[PDB]
Design a protein around this ligand. Structure first.
Ligand SMILES: O=C(O)c1ccccc1O
Ligand SMILES: O=C(O)c1ccccc1O
Ligand SMILES: O=C(O)c1ccccc1O
Ligand SMILES: O=C(O)c1ccccc1O
Ligand SMILES: O=C(O)c1ccccc1O
Ligand SMILES: O=C(O)c1ccccc1O
Ligand SMILES: O=C(O)c1ccccc1O
Ligand SMILES: O=C(O)c1ccccc1O
Ligand SMILES: C[As](C)(=O)[O-]
Lengths: 137, 139
């Protein structure tokens, strides 16, 4: 019970740690931090307002506005307030994906996609539930 | 041809949501112990196995200025007993409470799944974690 949660946390830190490493060059080449990168990542799924990003990240709305403002000054993001990636933000995400995809696909090339979709399903239901507790108090 | 990007995205959205929920569930407790979430993360590490500033900076990742300064503020708050580094009564107490809360919720969100379903999820995550390590050690 406790070891599962403990495992998930080591798993989360290891994923984040490898990602930070795999993406550091790219981020510096663009002059952005990991948090701005992470917002760029959220926006590649779809355009969002500062409010939705706040909800997703869980932080203070102004810490998000701060990242977004830096992103606009860097022109990696454009307005209408609906935020969406700009052409520069799009190039960034394509390189981020190219990188992340390369490693992931090599790392999972032997996975049985029939077995895996059952795992994805359990994780989608868990994510659903996570977002709901979050939704409330 | 390349839907892997969608799986990675999901995994990232999932990790993101777990962090968001964890921070919210643990904010009041971290406050009662007069510590922040970043300090909480670090204490979560030492409950695993006692360590030093070398190991910590690596696993942590990019930390080259105020990561050693967060170690300091732990001693002052009496959460790290020392070479080695262990949790103090205060430090172990916090982590115990932290585990309680996390487990209660991890149990509720999971009790209806079948053990077979969960064990297979654990197996996939474990091997991804094994390969991440068997990776984040080469270069
Ligand atoms: O059982 C687990 O360790 C586990 C870990 C992460 C996500 C779902 C899970 O069942
Ligand atoms: O870094 C770890 O080994 C770790 C382990 C469990 C929970 C959080 C963590 O950062
Ligand atoms: O840029 C990201 O989306 C990111 C995610 C996890 C860890 C480090 C990072 O830069
Ligand atoms: O840590 C934050 O305040 C933050 C804010 C926006 C996006 C990613 C983040 O980590
Ligand atoms: O069936 C798979 O592809 C699989 C992959 C990793 C771990 C356990 C598994 O069954
Ligand atoms: O997308 C998946 O099927 C998946 C499965 C296990 C772990 C992370 C994942 O994204
Ligand atoms: O939508 C999110 O909250 C999200 C978070 C992390 C990575 C990709 C994402 O779409
Ligand atoms: O406080 C923690 O140990 C923690 C861990 C993961 C995500 C957010 C957090 O606050
Ligand atoms: C941590 As930043 C450079 O996105 O304000």
């Amino acid at each position: 019970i406790e070891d599962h949660i403990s495992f998930l946390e080591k798993f989360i830190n290891d994923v984040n740690t490898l990602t930070a490493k795999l993406l550091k060059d790219l981020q510096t080449e663009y002059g952005i931090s990991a948090e701005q990168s992470h917002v760029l990542n959220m926006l590649s799924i779809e355009a969002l307002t500062v409010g939705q990003i706040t909800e997703k990240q869980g932080v203070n709305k102004a810490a998000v506005s701060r990242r977004v403002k830096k992103l606009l000054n860097a022109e990696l993001v454009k307005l209408e307030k609906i935020i969406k990636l700009s052409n520069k933000g799009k190039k960034y995400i394509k390189e981020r994906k190219a990188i992340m995809s390369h490693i992931a696909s090599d790392m999972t090339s032997d996975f049985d996609s029939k077995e895996i979709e059952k795992v994805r399903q359990v994780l989608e239901i868990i994510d659903y539930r996570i977002q709901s507790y979050t939704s409330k108090l």
